[PDB]
Amino acid sequence: INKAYEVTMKIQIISGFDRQLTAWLRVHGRRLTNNQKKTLFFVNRRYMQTHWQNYMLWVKRKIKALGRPAAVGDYTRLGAEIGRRVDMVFFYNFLSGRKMIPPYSAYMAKLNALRPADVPVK
Amino acid sequence: INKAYEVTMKIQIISGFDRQLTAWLRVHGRRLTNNQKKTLFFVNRRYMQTHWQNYMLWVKRKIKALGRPAAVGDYTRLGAEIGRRVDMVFFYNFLSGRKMIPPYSAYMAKLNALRPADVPVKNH
């Protein structure tokens, strides 16, 4: 059930990365402009996209290792695990500590405007 | 810091960062696209811009410590030292290591097309 599986995983991964960022922003957000905050949310979606194949390699081996028929809920749980086990807070700290949060551009707004279920992955 | 001094520093810093990137690329650039390489050259300019206030305080201290009035040759030297010693390699490793090199955008090509002397910084 391929796309139901991709959708629940994307929702959980983005949700999880977004939780890390919103938590981080409560501590560090004072210093950043609203555009810089939106850029970091873009970063979350882009990070998921550029690591999607690696997450799928790994998810494929975890389902396989179920010795069981995968239900969509398996995918929900594997996505939630990626969402909390990727250290995005390190990434925010490094990027902001290097003063290199990129400018908020229309192409970033475009990605942020999609529903999480529709964020394109390959 | 006066305009003439600003200009020799931007030239030397961008040149130094560019040399560091050119070096790093020999090791780490085999599988990047031309686009991705051009983004890291943009990153060098952007890095200088966002660290400009930091470099200006460092420069002020170095100049206070010179033991004589400063002249443009001192600023050329300090810009070259920043160009050499900032570690752009830890930043290039971070972007490439995480597969987060940004796409090459039109605004980036615009910044890359300026002469280093004309890259805007907050110094006016």
Q: What is the CATH number of the domain that holds A30?
A: 1.20.150.10
CB contact (8 A) between residue B50 and residue A99:
yes
Residues in chain A with CB shorter than 8 Å from the CB of B94 are 94, 98
CB contact (8 A) between residue B100 and residue A43:
yes
Question: Which method was used?
Answer: X-ray
Amino acid identity, residue B11?
I
* Dist. CA A112–CA A46, nearest whole Å: 10
Of the candidates A104, A1, A112, the one whose C-alpha atom is nearest the C-alpha of residue A49 is A112
Q: Alpha carbon of A35 to those of A23, A90, A105, A109, B50: distances in Å?
A: 17, 20, 9, 10, 16
**Residue A71 token pair:** 């239900």
Q: What angle do CA B33, A36, B107 make, to 5 degrees?
A: 40
CA distance A50 to chain B (A): 6
* Dist. CA B47–CA A100, nearest whole Å: 7
Number of domains in chain B: 1
Q: Sign of the CA dihedral B108, B114, B115, B120?
A: negative
Contact B47, B88 (CB under 8 A): yes
Q: Which residue of A has its CA nearest to B96?
A: A50
Q: Alpha carbon of A21 to those of A75, A78, A97, A111: distances in Å?
A: 23, 20, 15, 17
Contact B69, B121 (CB under 8 A): no
CB contact (8 A) between residue B91 and residue A100:
yes
Q: Alpha carbon of B40 to those of A64, A89, B35: distances in Å?
A: 39, 23, 9
CB contact (8 A) between residue B105 and residue A102:
no
Of the candidates A46, A51, A40, the one whose C-alpha atom is nearest the C-alpha of residue A102 is A40
Amino acid identity, residue A112?
N
Residues in chain A with CB shorter than 8 Å from the CB of B102 are 102
Q: What is the CA radius of gyration of chain A?
A: 15
Residues in chain B with CB shorter than 8 Å from the CB of A51 are 99
Nearest residue, CB atoms, A100 vs list B50, B98, B107: B50
CB contact (8 A) between residue A107 and residue B105:
yes
**What does the CA dihedral B3, B88, A42, A18 come to, rounded to 10 degrees?**
-120
Resolution (A): 1.7
Which range of residues forms the domain containing residue A54? 1-122
